[PDB]
Amino acid sequence: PAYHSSLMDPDTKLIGNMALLPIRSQFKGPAPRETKDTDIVDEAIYYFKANVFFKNYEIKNEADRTLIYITLYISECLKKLQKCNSKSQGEKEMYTLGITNFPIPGEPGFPLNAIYAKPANKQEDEVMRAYLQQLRQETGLRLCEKVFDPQNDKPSKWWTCFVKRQFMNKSLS
Amino acid sequence: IQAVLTLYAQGLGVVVDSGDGVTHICPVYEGFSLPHLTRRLDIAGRDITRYLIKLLLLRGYAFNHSADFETVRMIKEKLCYVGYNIEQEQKLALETTVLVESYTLPDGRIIKVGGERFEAPEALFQPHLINVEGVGVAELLFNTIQAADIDTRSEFYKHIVLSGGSTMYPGLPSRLERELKQLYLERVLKGDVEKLSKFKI
Amino acid sequence: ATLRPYLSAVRATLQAALCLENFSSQVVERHNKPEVEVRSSKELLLQPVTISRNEKEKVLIEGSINSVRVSIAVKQADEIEKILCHKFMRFMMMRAENFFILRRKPVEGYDISFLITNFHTEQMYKHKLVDFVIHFMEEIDKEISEMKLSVNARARIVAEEFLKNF
Amino acid sequence: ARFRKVDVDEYDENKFVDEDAGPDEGEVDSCLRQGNMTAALQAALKNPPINTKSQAVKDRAGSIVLKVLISFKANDIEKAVQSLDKNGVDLLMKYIYKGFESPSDNSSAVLLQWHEKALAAGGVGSIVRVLTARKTV
Amino acid sequence: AGRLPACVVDCGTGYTKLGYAGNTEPQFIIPSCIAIKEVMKGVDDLDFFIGDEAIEKPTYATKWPIRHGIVEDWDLMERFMEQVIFKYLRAEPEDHYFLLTEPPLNTPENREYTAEIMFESFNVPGLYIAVQAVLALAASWTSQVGERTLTGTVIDSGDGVTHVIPVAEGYVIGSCIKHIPIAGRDITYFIQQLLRDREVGIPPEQSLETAKAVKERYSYVCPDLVKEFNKYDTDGSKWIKQYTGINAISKKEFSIDVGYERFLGPEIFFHPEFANPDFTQPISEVVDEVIQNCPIDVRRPLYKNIVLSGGSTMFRDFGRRLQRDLKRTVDARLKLSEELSKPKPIDVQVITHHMQRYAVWFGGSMLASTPEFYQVCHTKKDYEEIGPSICRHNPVFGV
Amino acid sequence: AYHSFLVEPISCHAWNKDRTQIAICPNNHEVHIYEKSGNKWVQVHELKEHNGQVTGVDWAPDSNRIVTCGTDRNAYVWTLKGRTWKPTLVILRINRAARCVRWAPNEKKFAVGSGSRVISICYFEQENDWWVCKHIKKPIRSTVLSLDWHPNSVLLAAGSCDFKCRIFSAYIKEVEERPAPTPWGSKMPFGELMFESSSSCGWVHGVCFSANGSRVAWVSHDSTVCLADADKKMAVATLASETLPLLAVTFITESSLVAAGHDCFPVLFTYDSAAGKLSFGGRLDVPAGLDSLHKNSVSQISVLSGGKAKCSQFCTTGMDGGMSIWDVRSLESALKDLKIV
Amino acid sequence: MILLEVNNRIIEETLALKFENAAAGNKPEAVEVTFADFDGVLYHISNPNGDKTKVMVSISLKFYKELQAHGADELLKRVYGSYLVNPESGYNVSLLYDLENLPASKDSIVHQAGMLKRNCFASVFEKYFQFQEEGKEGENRAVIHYRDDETMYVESKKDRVTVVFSTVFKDDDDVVIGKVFMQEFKEGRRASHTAPQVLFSHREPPTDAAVGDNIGYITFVLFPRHTNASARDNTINLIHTFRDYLHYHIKCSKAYIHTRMRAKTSDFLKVLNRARP
């Protein structure tokens, strides 16, 4: 079946019902620092092409929810990367996009409000808003030295093609 | 003994109890039975059900003996009956369509059942049909009664009582009475007497 | 010329015959059978009657308290009409179950037979059953004729197609 | 399987059994030969063998009546039929159905004319009584 | 068996396989269609074509007498047979016993309709109607197996639907059959969409074609989705392929790369939801479910003998993947038994053999070459003396 | 005034005392009781106990008890216990289907005609708390098709397939007392044959006793209606119809009969005592593809009000599933030519 | 399809596929096919000795000896030449095709192989067409038993050549339908004056010729316009497929009757069910 995250620990920090998972990045955010060479953003980009085709997804950890979030986002980047002609540019479009405020668990316009808990107060709201943008950032750039072939202006059709498909028939946009 | 008890419930001959498991012809003398005469037929409901299964096969319906036993049992309970004159019954099944009846299977499919309605239960009268050696309920019943000490025959005959689910087949009482009348007219005489060879079931 | 008079006599008789009611057997505990078939209770059977149009075409009507048997001798002018009639009556008898009023085999001496029971006259308007049997007698003759022409029509095209190629 | 070959029902005490000698050939022949068609019919319809144990005796009567209907003009029938009382029409009908069992050249062609008239006068119930008769011609 | 071999005709919903008994493959495999012109007078009834010669006949209308494996139009099925016999097989029908096939749950009435045609139209000497499922089982005796048995689970995948059929002692346990809304037609479509969303220059009227051709030439079943995507992404040079078709207009040579769809195609067998919203249940579960509804005393045998049949089971590793997926679903189950408390291990085996594409016709050809075939056939004499009802039953045979 | 309760036959019916509830058998093993709410028919009860088709129903007016008999060989007396009807088995001691049943006026006993070629006369014994029956066998040779009690609750008219209409004495001294002489005879010991029609044609589909019971009428399959006048040495008047057989009949006055059968419409017959002759009073139903209210054979007819002496309304139910109510007075308006009695 | 095709599809298609893969340079697959044709003909296509580069097409005709007495062997050589090889055990004629030595135009040989049965029959007609074409009379008649209980009789005369078929209708009703078709042949001249004259005799033969209720004798009378060297072949194609043509049409008729019955019966049922409330 679909691919599930395995970064869940018997001691993982939780932001909402999502997993506050360590993500080696230089962006600001409540993201713990990671020592293991693979983070929740790798796991997401690795499984993307396989996961996106699934319509159903059984949540097993707060870790999954983060995976599902990073995945849905990936589709958003591809929606963008489909248009542009350079890795340099793409990296910019992912900083910009990675900043736009997409709805969050609890707001209208956020698909999956029955699976994602809403922040219990104004602190979590900011923490979460800040743990998420952090992810739309890290995820946003790592997705550039993938979607672009050593010969720029070339958004590999290997990624472009998924632009019309939506994981779980859901969309952040 | 359910035999004596059965007879009791009807304020009281010979009990013919037939269920899924087995058939029993138990005589009962003025209040208490009498083992020495009791007998068994190797044909009961489960056999008739089983026999229907095979008959339905020859008709174009393949029911799995294990998986579909319960279904065929309901088919039998609802549609089967005892033919009075098998010769007569066969001409109906062969020359007309009045015996054909529809039965909806659990999966929605609708099958038609005809001649096999009276043929399956006919095992009770012709055991060999199901590869069983014997004589069949009636001819059996007859012997049991003739093999009594008389001065009871009249009572016994005049008091045959059916018991058990496998004896509810429409027409069964009539078929026994015809069979017994036949065995009597031949194996006890030969001429036209039996205007007094009375006995009800 | 003689057709209409014939079918008219037939219809009247069917009207008289198709007056049935439910009747449980006097012979067998809890059984119900078409008396005209089983015939085990004489008082329940009616006088058999015949309506003949000529030496070959005729109808036999056999009533009883709960069922009527209607046998028809069909017109068969020649060998070809004979085999076609025969194949056609067989075709329908094989599908007797779909008809519910068709007998599986004809009464000895006839080409096709019906067995209409009280159950039929309850599930269907009896005056329309009488209307059907008559509509049936007329339509089979038409059908046998068409088939006959159909056969002679293909026969000729087949001979000319083969012969024309030499 | 031998004992079953005998129909023990034939001797059942609770069974059913019905509870148990022709026209004037000359009078019919005469009236016929004389040109009295309407009087020819009444002659033959007189004294039907409704109780003769033999078939031959009935057949004779059936033919005498058969001879009159055939010897009729498809235009002198309605006249004779209407000269009969209900019981007569009833009986005529019984004979008309008998005629149907012996197709001849056109005897059946004219018989269907008789049936048409007898019917118009007797009604379908006259046929019902053909079917219900236990002692019929 | 006389000097002439029996005629074996396997009429499917999409294709009809026909030939003589004893041969390993059919002599003709043609579309189950007849083309006619549209009161019939003269010899217009003979003016028709069947198979390939009936697909795009200008002045003729194409018809399909068989829907869902059952004969809908008997008039058309009867004419279809005239040419099967006299134009293709060139067999004197009066001289050959015939073996025709029927899907499971084919009514007794239909068998009499078939027999009325074969005996009363073509005067055949003997007829036998075999149930497809059973023949597929027989076909597998050619395999992985040294013990012949007519008890097993048959997965027949045509082009319309896939069937999971349990067979016990040569008889379909009809009440336990299940259908799967996934067949070659859907595999071809899913491959169609994937291309439209990535490949350019494919002639619109040649969409399905290019796709149907890609499925038939490059598709297979992979063991694991991500790892596969990984391969293609990593060493794409050794997994991506090329396909050049010929434009049926500008008659220019258009080419396209072939990737993901190679494995994603057959994958919808295991992940139906990938292309079907109304069905999500994996084929392995459907099989497991079918066997479970069957009599306990026969489920192990069913698990041990899963036979494949049809072109849509031809993808490389289909059986390997099916058996794996099933072994799990099955052990995981027996697992909760220990935890909830040691049920003996259940043996799950999926058989694959060379004759799968037309497993059914092959079984029929093999069985109709035996003397026993002639014993179980219903002869013409019997049909005439006993009636078309004898054809309601057709004794299984061969084990 | 026709109403369709269903499109399959209504096997038989029975109305309560006030004609406020009608009990019917919708061609099955059950008995449905309907009642009117405004101008709509509402089903208020379903009696399910019989194991075969119900062939006869009768409702005793004063004791408000329903009796039913079926092909299952049984008979049940139904008693209303608050809001539900409870059946009490009555052994008829027969081995063939029961065909008809009628309570006696005195409601002290009912009669069941059956295929065992016999009439079962049943009555309750408040000593052992159960029903018992005595048979009237001779000279019955076939299935008994219809029954109708005499106003004295002793004489019983019976119609059967042996083509006879008979009057018997169903006198049970154990529930009633010595009957007063009748023009039909002064000796009425149990089972006494008082009168027997003389005919060998047609099953007797229906029998009926007049208001004062000195006349009995019956309809047979040979399409004839008959009436035997006991005030005239049991002379028998006969009228041969031109139409199909009648299945049901009833007196609507001392000299008027209303019957219906396979033609599907009720017709009138009058009796001329002086002449001793019966005449055809004409069709009463004057205008699928029929011009008649009912679309199939009418098989049962009953007096709804005015009784047999001066009936003002009668009911008919047939094989078409319909129930009709006929207003005598209304019929007399729409047909100035109609002459009753 | 009114006229039965004369060639054999399985032969042509089997050979066409092998030749194609041979030219393409693919490795030869093994082939093994057994099939039949009308009149008890049996064929076998195979690789002799298992040599996959060799495809043999063999035909078996129970009545070959008889055709051999009338020029078959000679005609077959004329037609096939080096393609002929000693007949495979169980067959009378064998064609051997070397997949490593095929002609430029393969169609000609595929077409000829496809007509093996036809070319085994042609011989007898060609002979007798020659007898007539040279006034040669008195010459004995050919008696060919093309079926176990059917016979063909060829005979030459001064002006005409006559072919007599003794066919059998197993089905009693097939005889009747047959007479209808035969009647139309006996009159086909009323649509083609210059076409062969057909004669027909039911029970009675026009020798030990069998006499029975299910036997029929058709007789074609061929004139020089049909038997000459320019029409000859076409005439052979028709005349030798005649018997199967007749039976094929008797059978197709029965099929058409069936469609008429399905329709009529269907109508009947619609009426019956309209009689339901």
Curated annotation (Swiss-Prot), chain C:
Complex and partners: Component of the Arp2/3 complex composed of ACTR2/ARP2, ACTR3/ARP3, ARPC1B/p41-ARC, ARPC2/p34-ARC, ARPC3/p21-ARC, ARPC4/p20-ARC and ARPC5/p16-ARC.
Name of the protein this chain belongs to: Actin-related protein 2/3 complex subunit 4
Entry's family note: Belongs to the ARPC4 family.
Predominant location category: cytoplasm
Cellular location(s): Cytoplasm, Cytoskeleton; Cell projection; Nucleus
Name of a matching Pfam family: ARPC4
Keyword presence, Acetylation: yes
Gene Ontology biological process terms, A to Z: actin filament polymerization; Arp2/3 complex-mediated actin nucleation
GO MF term list: actin filament binding
Gene Ontology CC annotations of this record: Arp2/3 protein complex; cell projection; cytosol; nucleus; site of double-strand break
Signal peptide: none
Function as written in the Swiss-Prot or TrEMBL entry: Actin-binding component of the Arp2/3 complex, a multiprotein complex that mediates actin polymerization upon stimulation by nucleation-promoting factor (NPF). The Arp2/3 complex mediates the formation of branched actin networks in the cytoplasm, providing the force for cell motility. In addition to its role in the cytoplasmic cytoskeleton, the Arp2/3 complex also promotes actin polymerization in the nucleus, thereby regulating gene transcription and repair of damaged DNA.
Keywords assigned: Acetylation, Actin-binding, Cell projection, Cytoplasm, Cytoskeleton, Nucleus
SUPFAM superfamilies, alphabetized: Arp2/3 complex subunits
UniProtKB/Swiss-Prot annotation, chain D:
One annotated GO biological process: regulation of actin filament polymerization
Stored Gene3D superfamilies: Actin-related protein 2/3 complex subunit 5
Subcellular location: Cytoplasm, Cytoskeleton; Cell projection; Nucleus
InterPro entries listed in its UniProt record: ARPC5, ARPC5_sf
SUPFAM superfamilies for this protein: Arp2/3 complex 16 kDa subunit ARPC5
Keyword list, A-Z: Acetylation, Actin-binding, Cell projection, Cytoplasm, Cytoskeleton, Nucleus, Ubl conjugation
Region feature (Disordered): 13-28
One Gene Ontology term, aspect cellular component: site of double-strand break
Post-translational modifications reported in the UniProt record: Polyubiquitinated by RNF128 with 'Lys-63'-linked chains, leading to proteasomal degradation.
UniProt family annotation: Belongs to the ARPC5 family.
Function: Component of the Arp2/3 complex, a multiprotein complex that mediates actin polymerization upon stimulation by nucleation-promoting factor (NPF). The Arp2/3 complex mediates the formation of branched actin networks in the cytoplasm, providing the force for cell motility. In addition to its role in the cytoplasmic cytoskeleton, the Arp2/3 complex also promotes actin polymerization in the nucleus, thereby regulating gene transcription and repair of damaged DNA.
Protein name: Actin-related protein 2/3 complex subunit 5
Originating organism: Bos taurus
Organism taxonomic ancestry: Eukaryota, Metazoa, Chordata, Craniata, Vertebrata
Chain's gene name: ARPC5
From Swiss-Prot, chain E:
GO annotation terms (biological process): Arp2/3 complex-mediated actin nucleation; cilium assembly; positive regulation of lamellipodium assembly; positive regulation of transcription by RNA polymerase II
Keyword Acetylation carried by entry: yes
Subcellular location: Cytoplasm, Cytoskeleton; Cell projection; Nucleus
Protein's UniProt name: Actin-related protein 3
Function field: ATP-binding component of the Arp2/3 complex, a multiprotein complex that mediates actin polymerization upon stimulation by nucleation-promoting factor (NPF). The Arp2/3 complex mediates the formation of branched actin networks in the cytoplasm, providing the force for cell motility. Seems to contact the pointed end of the daughter actin filament. In podocytes, required for the formation of lamellipodia downstream of AVIL and PLCE1 regulation.
Modified residues (N6-acetyllysine): 227, 231, 238, 241
Entries under Pfam families matching the protein: Actin
Family membership noted in the UniProt record: Belongs to the actin family. ARP3 subfamily.
Domain of life where this protein originates: Eukaryota
Coiled coil residues, start to end: none
Keywords: Acetylation, Actin-binding, ATP-binding, Cell projection, Cilium biogenesis/degradation, Cytoplasm, Cytoskeleton, Nucleotide-binding, Nucleus
Assembly: Component of the Arp2/3 complex composed of ACTR2/ARP2, ACTR3/ARP3, ARPC1B/p41-ARC, ARPC2/p34-ARC, ARPC3/p21-ARC, ARPC4/p20-ARC and ARPC5/p16-ARC. Interacts with WHDC1. Interacts weakly with MEFV. Interacts with AVIL.
PROSITE patterns assigned: ACTINS_ACT_LIKE
Originating organism: Bos taurus
GO cellular component: Arp2/3 protein complex; cell projection; cytoplasm; cytosol; nucleus; site of double-strand break
Keyword Nucleus: yes
Modified residues (N-acetylalanine): 1
From Swiss-Prot, chain G:
Function field: Actin-binding component of the Arp2/3 complex, a multiprotein complex that mediates actin polymerization upon stimulation by nucleation-promoting factor (NPF). The Arp2/3 complex mediates the formation of branched actin networks in the cytoplasm, providing the force for cell motility. Seems to contact the mother actin filament. In addition to its role in the cytoplasmic cytoskeleton, the Arp2/3 complex also promotes actin polymerization in the nucleus, thereby regulating gene transcription and repair of damaged DNA.
Modified-residue entries (N6-acetyllysine), positions: 270
Localization in the cell: Cytoplasm, Cytoskeleton; Cell projection; Synapse, Synaptosome; Nucleus
Keyword Transmembrane attributed: no
GO process annotations (BP): actin filament polymerization; Arp2/3 complex-mediated actin nucleation; positive regulation of actin filament polymerization; positive regulation of lamellipodium assembly; positive regulation of substrate adhesion-dependent cell spreading
Main location group: cytoplasm
Protein name: Actin-related protein 2/3 complex subunit 2
Pfam families for this protein: P34-Arc (PF04045)
Recorded GO CC terms: Arp2/3 protein complex; cytosol; endosome; focal adhesion; glutamatergic synapse; lamellipodium; muscle cell projection membrane; neuron projection
Protein's gene: ARPC2
Keyword vocabulary terms for this entry: Acetylation, Actin-binding, Cell projection, Cytoplasm, Cytoskeleton, Nucleus, Synapse, Synaptosome
UniProt family annotation: Belongs to the ARPC2 family.
A molecular function GO annotation: structural constituent of cytoskeleton
Keyword hit for Acetylation: yes
